[PDB]
Amino acid sequence: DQLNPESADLRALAKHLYDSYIKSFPLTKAKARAILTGKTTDKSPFVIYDMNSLMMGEDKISKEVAIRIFQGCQFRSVEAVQEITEYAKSIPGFVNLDLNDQVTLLKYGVHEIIYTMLASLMNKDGVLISEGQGFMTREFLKSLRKPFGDFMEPKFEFAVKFNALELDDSDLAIFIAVIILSGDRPGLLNVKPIEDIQDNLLQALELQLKLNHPESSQLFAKLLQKMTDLRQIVTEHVQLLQVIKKTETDMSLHPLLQEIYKDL
Numbered sequence: 001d002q003l004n005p006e007s008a009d010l011r012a013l014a015k016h017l018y019d020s021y022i023k024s025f026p027l028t029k030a031k032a033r034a035i036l037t038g039k040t041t042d043k044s045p046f047v048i049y050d051m052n053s054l055m056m057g058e059d060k061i062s063k064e065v066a067i068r069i070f071q072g073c074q075f076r077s078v079e080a081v082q083e084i085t086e087y088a089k090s091i092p093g094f095v096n097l098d099l100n101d102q103v104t105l106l107k108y109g110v111h112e113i114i115y116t117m118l119a120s121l122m123n124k125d126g127v128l129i130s131e132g133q134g135f136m137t138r139e140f141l142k143s144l145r146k147p148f149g150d151f152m153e154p155k156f157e158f159a160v161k162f163n164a165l166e167l168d169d170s171d172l173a174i175f176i177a178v179i180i181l182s183g184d185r186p187g188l189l190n191v192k193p194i195e196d197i198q199d200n201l202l203q204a205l206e207l208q209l210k211l212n213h214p215e216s217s218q219l220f221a222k223l224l225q226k227m228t229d230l231r232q233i234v235t236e237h238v239q240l241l242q243v244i245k246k247t248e249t250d251m252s253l254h255p256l257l258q259e260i261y262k263d264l
């Protein structure tokens, strides 16, 4: 039989992470795909695709429209940062790390994770919003005044590609744990304890994918290669925020987000 004690421990680790992910993230990929695909009469989103539907959306779900949307987006990111911080504490070994490194791991990790999980809420046509009650189209977003009309496009581009891996939540739980425990983060005090945890997470992810996706060759490698896409989305996003700060000096940014962005 395949399972030995070592691979048994990796299965127990996969199970624990999946459990913690479910407990930390109220809107899973499974729920998102059920809303998006019409496993539904109770789960249908209201669709925002223009100014009028936007106005009607606000009714059923003050400033300039681009700004309201961007701020709505900032607030959800703050929520996601909180959910991800709750999840991270569940990753075995994580809270036993030097407090400074915990902060560093989160600071550089959370945006990569946000866009990973945001892919679960996207298809080629738009993105779920407000806990799945709404769906805002990609074209509507793209139509926003400069520079806001461009903020979401690289996220959709990534999501379309990432979604072709067809990962489910149990896969993603291990993958986002791997992301958080990156020993290559800038300013880390003790890299070794992080690398040892990541090594364990990596073995767990490898096994999960082999078992969950037996006909999907080199999926593990293909998934690791996606980290390059995420890192690049994050860099572009930060650059676009520097532009927004200067053109929209009357627009405030959540300090939790501001501290994350500080010298990324």
Ligand SMILES: COc1cc(CCc2ccccc2)c(C(=O)O)c(O)c1CC=C(C)C
Binding pocket: 054, 057, 058, 068, 069, 070, 072, 073, 076, 077, 080, 114, 118, 127, 128, 129, 130, 131, 136, 141, 152
């Ligand atoms: C465009 O990106 C939005 C925007 C929004 C704001 C949608 C909105 C704002 C203001 C008026 C009408 C609709 C939400 C939301 O409200 O849940 C959202 O989850 C997202 C997903 C984005 C993330 C997690 C970065």
